[PDB]
Structures are given as structure tokens and as C-alpha cells.
């Protein structure tokens, strides 16, 4: 709690749905947004801050609250848009040999600034005396270790709590989330959304030699003709859907009522039957 990591993670496909099956978590509360809509929001960088507290101290981790740990080791203002994901770790962090490794900084002068890490080890000086280093009646160790033991009950066990602080500064967002895909359909007028490029057409196979850096592709006068497959390298062709003018041939409403229908721009295989120019 006095020395917590501040890993600045970015440039990844943060799939929050996977976190629901990695480890048997016991807390998945998120204050900012919903996890269903979180997978569709881009972010710049996530601040991963992890620490270990007891079971009765998990409630103190809130956007604004007082306590022995909420204002002395880690404080969250009223703007935390992440989560408070946490889980019990009483399976490998509790042995009967003396757990004098952790601490919680029982002694302090005042409330620390939220989202701040104070890595200090000086002797706590309770005023009215210059303590150049002494331990008696005026200046004591401001750190005190826990008493985690395996033969205990829930509530005073080591609980690993990790928060994911989100921020959106004046910089383009890097991490957005997981993106899915669908099966490719060839020789059929369907819709396509290849990397934002939306439209409809018949995805066919072409023989164009695209450049290794080019992704999209246009025509002589402002019309997309072929793009690059977002998957493995494949050269396709985007031709518009089936369209044409319909003309009806009628010999006149004086002898009969039989008419002929002519579809323009079709090879009789895309709608007796005759194929003309």
C-alpha cells in the first residue's frame, strides 16, 4: 500500500470480457461506466495500481472516503472512471513463518494527495522535539506489519486490490478494445465496413498489385474500387450492387395486353429470356 505499481499500459486490445474468466475475482464494481459499453470506448492510457489490504478494508476503497487506509496510503477523488477489481489471495500469500513483510503506515501527519505514492522510511516525528533518529517516548516507527495467518477467517486475509485509472488528455487514444470479424462472402452484393469504410457492393477477386503500405483504393473520379483485406493479404475488388433501368415494351392497349420487360445492365443471371447489348 505504501509502494504500489504505476504501470502505464497502452497500445493493446483491452478485452474486459476476458477478465471475467482469468481468476475467480470477488469484486468487479466499476464506478465510471458499464462493462458492456466499456469495450466500445477508446482510451489513451490506463494506470494500473495494485495493492494488498484486508477484507474489512476493501470497502474503504471508494471515490471519496476516510479511514486508516483510504486517506493514508491511497485516495481516490470523485472522478474515478475505472473499476475496483479485487480478489482474495489467501492461497499462496499466507504461511506460518512470520508475516513481517507488509505494512500500512499507521502513523501520518495529514491526509495525502489522492493518487500519490510516498515512499518514505523516516522516523515519525510528533513535533516539539528534534528527532535525529531515536525510538522512545517521542518518535516511533511509522510503519507496522500485518498479522496474516493461514488459520484465520475471512475479513482479515490478504486481498489483492487493483484499480484501473482512466484518463483522456489532449492526445489521441491508443487502447480501444476488442474488435470482431465475420466470414467473407464472394460474388454477392452485401454490405462492408472494412476499417470504417462503409458501403455495399459485390466483393470479387481481382488481380491488382497493391503496394505494401496502401490499404484503400479509389478510381479516376472519386469512387472506391478495391481495398485491402484487414486479415491476411488478399487482393479483392469492390463493384457496386445490382442496379439498372426497367423499360416496358407495350404494343398498345388496342389489340392485347401482353408486355415485355427489359432490364438494363444485366447478363440475365443477376436479376422467354434473351440477352442483348
Amino acid at each position: 500500500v505504501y509502494a504500489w505499481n504505476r504501470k502505464r499500459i497502452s497500445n493493446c486490445v483491452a478485452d474486459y470480457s476476458v477478465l471475467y474468466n482469468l481468476a475467480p475475482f470477488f469484486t468487479f464494481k466499476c464506478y465510471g461506466v458499464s462493462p458492456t459499453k466499456l469495450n466500445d470506448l477508446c482510451f489513451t492510457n490506463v494506470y494500473a495500481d495494485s495493492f494488498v489490504i484486508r477484507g474489512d478494508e476493501v470497502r474503504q476503497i471508494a471515490p471519496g472516503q476516510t479511514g486508516n487506509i483510504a486517506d493514508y496510503n491511497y485516495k481516490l477523488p470523485d472522478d474515478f472512471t475505472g473499476c475496483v477489481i479485487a480478489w482474495n489471495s489467501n492461497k499462496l500469500d499466507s504461511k506460518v513463518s512470520g508475516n513481517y513483510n507488509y505494512l500500512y503506515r499507521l502513523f501520518r501527519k495529514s491526509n495525502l494527495k489522492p493518487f500519490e505514492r510516498d515512499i518514505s522510511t523516516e522516523i515519525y516525528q510528533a513535533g516539539n522535539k528534534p528527532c535525529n533518529g531515536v525510538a522512545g517516548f517521542n518518535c516511533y516507527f511509522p510503519l507496522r506489519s500485518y498479522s496474516f495467518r493461514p488459520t484465520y477467517g475471512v475479513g482479515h486475509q490478504p486481498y489483492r486490490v487493483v484499480v484501473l485509472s482512466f484518463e483522456l488528455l489532449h492526445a489521441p487514444a491508443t487502447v480501444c478494445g476488442p474488435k470482431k470479424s465475420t466470414n467473407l462472402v464472394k460474388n454477392k452484393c452485401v454490405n462492408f465496413n472494412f476499417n470504417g469504410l462503409k458501403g455495399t457492393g459485390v466483393l470479387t477477386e481481382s488481380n491488382k498489385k497493391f503496394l505494401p503500405f496502401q490499404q484503400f483504393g479509389r478510381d479516376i473520379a472519386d469512387t472506391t474500387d478495391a481495398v485491402r483485406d484487414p486479415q491476411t493479404l488478399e487482393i479483392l475488388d469492390i463493384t457496386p450492387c445490382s442496379f439498372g433501368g426497367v423499360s416496358v415494351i407495350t404494343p398498345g392497349t388496342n389489340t392485347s395486353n401482353q408486355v415485355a420487360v427489359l432490364y438494363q445492365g444485366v447478363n440475365c443471371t443477376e436479376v422467354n429470356v434473351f440477352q442483348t447489348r
Partner: single-chain antibody
Framework: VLTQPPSASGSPGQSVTISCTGTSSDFGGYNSVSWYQQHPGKAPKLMIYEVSKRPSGVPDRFSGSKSGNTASLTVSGLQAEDEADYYCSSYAGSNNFDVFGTGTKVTVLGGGGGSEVQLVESGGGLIQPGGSLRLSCAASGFTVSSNYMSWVRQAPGKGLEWVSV???????YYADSVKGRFTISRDNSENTLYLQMNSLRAEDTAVYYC???????????????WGQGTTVTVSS
């Protein structure tokens, strides 16, 4: 609510070995069970804070091992003349007051802190029911603005209970008895630290005790110094 024996007088100083049952757990986290010797008149004095390592005092009261689910403080062989009340502290859960126990009469016979830092109070003689009375414990020694202090009151017949807890600079937690009607306000950071009554509800008649250290999360603090209390004597 804890379990303590009403009285203990048979076999004086040979098989008394008083304790405090009613835990049914492993004392929560940090196993720190303190024992206070509440004596009539002056303020009580600390006897032992942990299960071992007794502080500077009488050496005939030690071996406070936690047998089963209770701390059995070995008091046999101490003396044969004492008139006081022993209280134990437990139930160290987060935000849980009333850590003291009931009145245990440990008189083995029945019939037969002063200049350390400071001891001052307000002297609330003939307190009018309601209003706002301030009680201070100005200490010219230890800092009255950096150490963790608390307020515990006790009434005739009834035992002690946690009434107020105040941390270093940013915590003003109140007990469940007042439930909000009590507002703690710190005085100047270099003069003293006083309290506030805030329209008592006729239950604040008990005498107050301003301790320089915590009760349930008690730390060594060099020495445990208490202060004599004053009678409220409400006229509701």
C-alpha cells in the same frame, strides 16, 4: 457486546485467572487485547497491552496467553488487597465501537500519570441540559495535534464504551451511541484539542476521559497516560 464474569472473589490470588469470553473467532486481525485497571477515584491505568511483554509496572501480573477463544490473564500470586475493576478489549473489526466489557468485580479482599505530560479538563459543574459545553485536555508535553487520541466515557454501574475516535488530520468518525448528534472540532494545532457537546440527549451525564492513545488499536506510545474526569450532572 462481550462476556465477562460478574464478580470474582473466591480463592483470592490463587485461582482467579479472570478472562473475557464471547469472541467465537480469532480476535480478528492483530491480536492485541489490552487490560485496564479501572480504580474508583483517579483515572484507570494500563496493565498490559499484548499477550506478553508487560510494560513498566508491577511484575506479578503477566502470562496473558490466549487460551481457546479468550485471553486468560494470569493474575494469581499478585497480591491480597485490591479494590478495582478489570476490563478487557477485543473485537478489533473495522468501525466497531463498544470494545470494552462489563463490570467485573475482581476484588480479592474487598475491605482492604500525574506529572507525566499533563492532565486538565473543563469541570462541567451543574451542566444545563442541552447547549454546547467544551472539554479540553491541553497537554504541554506530547503533541495534542499529531498523536491518535480518543474519548471514552463511563457511567455509575455501567462499563466503558468507545464514544469518539479522531485520527491525525482527516478522520472524524463518531460512535454509534450519538449516531451524528456529536460533532468533534479540533482547537488550534499548537494550543490544545477540545470537544463539543452539541445538544446532549440526557445520556451524556457520564464522566468523560480524554486519553492520549487509542483503546482497541492501542500502540505503545512510550507510556500510557490518562486524566481524571469530571461529573456532568445534567438537570434534564
Amino acid at each position: 457486546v462481550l462476556t465477562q464474569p460478574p464478580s470474582a472473589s473466591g480463592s483470592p490470588g490463587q485461582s482467579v485467572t479472570i478472562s473475557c469470553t464471547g469472541t467465537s473467532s480469532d480476535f480478528g486481525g492483530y491480536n492485541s487485547v489490552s487490560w485496564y485497571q479501572q480504580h474508583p477515584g483517579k483515572a484507570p491505568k494500563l496493565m498490559i497491552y499484548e499477550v506478553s511483554k508487560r510494560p513498566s509496572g508491577v511484575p506479578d501480573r503477566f502470562s496473558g496467553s490466549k487460551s481457546g477463544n479468550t485471553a486468560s490473564l494470569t493474575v494469581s500470586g499478585l497480591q491480597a488487597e485490591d479494590e478495582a475493576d478489570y476490563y478487557c478489549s477485543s473485537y478489533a473489526g473495522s468501525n466497531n465501537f463498544d470494545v470494552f466489557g462489563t463490570g467485573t468485580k475482581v476484588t480479592v479482599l474487598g475491605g482492604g500519570g500525574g506529572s507525566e505530560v499533563q492532565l486538565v479538563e473543563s469541570g462541567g459543574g451543574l451542566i444545563q441540559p442541552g447547549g454546547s459545553l467544551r472539554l479540553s485536555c491541553a497537554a504541554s508535553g506530547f503533541t495534542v495535534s499529531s498523536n491518535y487520541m480518543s474519548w471514552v466515557r463511563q457511567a455509575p454501574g455501567k462499563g466503558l464504551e468507545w464514544v469518539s475516535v479522531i485520527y491525525s488530520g482527516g478522520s472524524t468518525y463518531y460512535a454509534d451511541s450519538v449516531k451524528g448528534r456529536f460533532t468533534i472540532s479540533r482547537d488550534n494545532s499548537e494550543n490544545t484539542l477540545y470537544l463539543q457537546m452539541n445538544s446532549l440527549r440526557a445520556e451524556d451525564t457520564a464522566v468523560y476521559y480524554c486519553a492520549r492513545g487509542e483503546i482497541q488499536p492501542y500502540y505503545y506510545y512510550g507510556m500510557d497516560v490518562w486524566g481524571q474526569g469530571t461529573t456532568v450532572t445534567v438537570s434534564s
